[PDB]
């Protein structure tokens, strides 16, 4: 069925002076009688106002589509004096059409997203998705095109879908952990006179174990009174696998001992030495330990290639 009951009013402008959108009509003959038009419905006589006899309807108000895009209305046909219906009323809509006064706009102010450290160039990161208020049905009033406006240890915003990718080969965090990129979107765009919506994106990377652990220095020295019939502990040597977290927690043990325990630890990841067997002898004054400390998992937690796991020597002297 053909639709013909619709009028299109361009929104907001006219400034002052008013614009007709449609003159109505019922056909019929003359013959010494006449039709006077009366209009009723939405914002009747106030927004849209009718010149009676003719059928002329100008808008006498700024129209905002985003407020309300359609206005179901009902105008009439009666004689002037008779007022008897010279045509039973019709229902019909008036539409706007939306002009690009409405901006591109992001839902949250800043955004924060994470991505696995060293991973092949172009790895998915997140979608940023703005929003234009306008008409997504006609023209380029809304069609948006995203772009990385800045963020140059590099990611790519894939322009159609806005999805962020990385733009960089590997990306060893130990260099830089957090990343700032500023995001755009053009109304039309591909065409200037476009609109401009920006957002902050805090990008951080995760970890991997691309680090063996460290020892403060290669040769340690300590000292001790010769029995302590309690415990006890003597010294602390440290590892620092820069690769944080679980990827940092390292395992100590000694590989010139046996009078000495060595202890965990999730304390700072040291490093402590208890005296196991008590003590007795001058027979020794000097003692020696070599100590392996290494990162962990339940399957190979060095899935790359790691060289040292820092050994190192401890010299304990007697008193």
126 binds, among its own copies, Ca ion, none (CB under 5 to 8 A by kind): none
Contacts of 196 (CB under 8 A, 6+ apart): 104, 184, 185, 186, 187
**In this structure, is the dihedral angle defined by the CA atoms of residues 56, 61, 65 and 71, taken in order, positive or negative?**
negative
8 binds, among its own copies, Ca ion, none (CB under 5 to 8 A by kind): its own copies
Q: Kindly state the tokens that stand for 309.
A: 């796991």
158 binds, among its own copies, Ca ion, none (CB under 5 to 8 A by kind): none
Q: How far is the CB of 65 from Ca ion (least distance, A)?
A: 5
SS3 of residue 44 by DSSP: strand
* Interface with Ca ion (CB under 5 A), residue from 128, 134, 165, 269: 134
Q: Kindly state the tokens that stand for 118.
A: 């060293």
SS3 of residue 155 by DSSP: strand
The span from the CA of 313 to the CA of 222, in Å, is: 11
Contacts of 2 (CB under 8 A, 6+ apart): none
* Interface with Ca ion (CB under 5 A), residue from 73, 181, 295, 309: 295
* Residues within window 169-208 making contact with Ca ion, judged by CB under 5 A: 173, 187, 207-208
Report phi then psi at 174, rounded to 5.
-25, -15
Report phi then psi at 292, rounded to 5.
-85, 130
Is 249 a binding residue for Ca ion by CB under 5 A? The answer is no
* Interface with Ca ion (CB under 5 A), residue from 9, 73, 100, 164: 100
Residue 149 CB-density burial (10 A; 0-12 exposed, 13-18 middle, 19+ buried): middle
Is 192 a binding residue for its own copies by CB under 8 A? The answer is no
* Interface with Ca ion (CB under 5 A), residue from 59, 75, 76, 102: 102
26 binds, among its own copies, Ca ion, none (CB under 5 to 8 A by kind): its own copies
192 binds, among Ca ion, its own copies, none (CB under 5 to 8 A by kind): none
Q: Kindly state the tokens that stand for 90.
A: 């019709």
Between 3 and 266, whose beta carbon lies closer to its own copies? 3
* Interface with its own copies (CB under 8 A), residue from 26, 40, 204, 311: 26
* Interface with its own copies (CB under 8 A), residue from 15, 16, 17, 27: 27
Between 28 and 228, whose beta carbon lies closer to its own copies? 28
257 binds, among its own copies, Ca ion, none (CB under 5 to 8 A by kind): none
Residue 178 CB-density burial (10 A; 0-12 exposed, 13-18 middle, 19+ buried): exposed
138 binds, among its own copies, Ca ion, none (CB under 5 to 8 A by kind): its own copies
| Residue in 200, 162, 209, 178 with CA at minimum distance from that of residue 114 | 178
Near its own copies by CB under 8 A, which window of 2-10, 154-162, 177-185, 252-260? 2-10
Q: Which chain residues interact with its own copies by CB under 8 A?
A: 1-6, 8, 20-28, 54, 56, 87, 90, 92, 97, 138
């Amino acid at each position: 069925s053909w639709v013909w009951n619709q009028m299109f009013v361009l929104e907001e402008f006219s400034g002052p002076e008013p614009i007709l959108v449609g003159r109505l009509h019922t056909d019929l003959d003359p013959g010494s009688k006449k039709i006077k038009y009366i209009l009723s419905g939405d914002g009747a006589g106030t927004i849209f106002q009718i010149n009676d006899i003719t059928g002329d309807i100008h808008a006498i108000k700024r129209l905002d589509r985003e407020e309300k895009a359609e206005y179901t209305l009902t105008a009439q046909a009666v004689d002037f004096e008779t007022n008897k219906p010279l045509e039973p009323p019709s229902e019909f809509i008036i539409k706007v059409q939306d002009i690009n006064d409405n901006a591109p706009e992001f839902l949250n102010g800043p955004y924060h997203a994470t991505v696995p450290e060293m991973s092949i160039l172009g790895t998915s990161v997140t979608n940023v998705t703005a929003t234009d208020a306008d008409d997504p049905v006609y023209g380029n009033s809304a069609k948006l095109v995203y772009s990385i406006l800045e963020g140059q240890p590099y990611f790519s915003i894939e322009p159609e879908t806005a999805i962020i990718k990385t733009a960089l080969p590997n990306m060893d965090r130990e260099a830089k952990e957090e990343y700032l990129v500023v995001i755009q979107a053009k109304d039309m765009g591909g065409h200037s006179g476009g609109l401009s919506g920006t957002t902050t994106l805090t990008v951080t990377l995760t970890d991997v174990n691309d680090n063996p652990p460290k020892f403060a220095q290669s040769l340690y020295h300590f000292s001790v009174p010769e029995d302590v019939v309690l415990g006890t502990a003597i010294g602390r040597v440290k590892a620092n696998d820069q690769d944080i977290g679980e990827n940092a927690q390292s395992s100590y043990d000694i590989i010139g001992t046996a009078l000495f325990e060595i202890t965990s630890d999730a304390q700072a990841q040291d490093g402590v030495i208890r005296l196991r067997k008590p003590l007795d002898f001058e027979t020794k004054k000097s003692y020696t330990l070599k100590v392996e400390a290494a990162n962990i998992h339940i399957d190979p937690r060095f899935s790359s290639r790691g060289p040292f796991k820092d050994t190192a020597t401890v010299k304990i002297v007697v008193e």
